[PDB]
């Protein structure tokens with residue numbers, strides 16, 4: 001059974017609600033992004049209308065085989081009428097194709113569903129500038145002040161400088177980057193660009209990346225592993241055993257691995273600055289954990305909410321424990337008393 005924070009009142013609509021069977025009263029199922037916790041339940045046998053971005057709809061068709069007649073792609077930043085209700089899709093600054101959804105209800109209520117997002121001051125100059133929001137369905141993944149991390153631009157600067165230095169010292173070093181979902185593509189693209197290489201990967205990953213509308217992608221990626229000195233591997237393989245095994249397969253082309261694991265936040269962020277980050281090393285293999293987040297930090301979330309001034313907030317993450325719920329409600333009241341809404 002579908003929980004309340006996935007239903008949009010006054011509509012036939014649900015958001016990210018595919019694992020509950022047929023939802024009573026639902027005439028259109030919105031999907032904010034192609035991450036498995038959110039699409040859980042969709043397959044080629046799905047027969048109700050799905051509304052999404054173009055990039056999400058390419059993934060639904062090619063990766064999950066949803067039939068085309070049920071995929072309804074909408075352009076971003078454009079007022080659209082769906083089943084008699086005005087909606088807009090906005091870029092969420094999450095993974096490729098990820099959207100927030102603005103719903104203009106028939107009674108005059110305006111609702112923003114953020115999906116998963118990384119709040120940014122640029123969102124203060126989107127179509128949100130123009131009008132009031134009564135209800136905010138908020139991605140609260142890192143809603144506590146202990147959650148700090150650097151900008152994506154600082155993290156990429158660290159990765160590129162670390163990879164360029166290592167491979168210039170040792171031309172026979174291979175770089176490996178872990179992945180397990182879409183998102184975070186700038187990590188491996190930025191490293192391969194500084195090295196003058198294509199990125200090498202499995203056929204399954206190449207297929208996924210070909211659905212993402214990245215400009216000049218054919219110039220950046222390949223399935224010919226022998227031609228490339230930046231390889232992608234599943235995230236589960238980014239450990240000393242899996243990397244040793246990979247280096248064997250490379251026919252004596254390389255004598256060292258430098259590997260990256262993009263994570264979200266980890267507790268070493270409470271102590272260590274990005275510039276001071278060091279790897280774990282075993283012989284000729286080194287592994288860097290880098291805190292590349294596609295969700296809001298606490299401070300980014302607080303800024304966005306204090307700017308938007310919603311009348312009511314419904315969290316969509318960390319909703320399963322009383323302690324998490326109580327914590328989040330305390331911070332929403334702090335924010336509201338501090339800003340005066």
Ligand code: NI
Nearest residue numbers: 033035094116
């Ligand atoms: Ni996500």
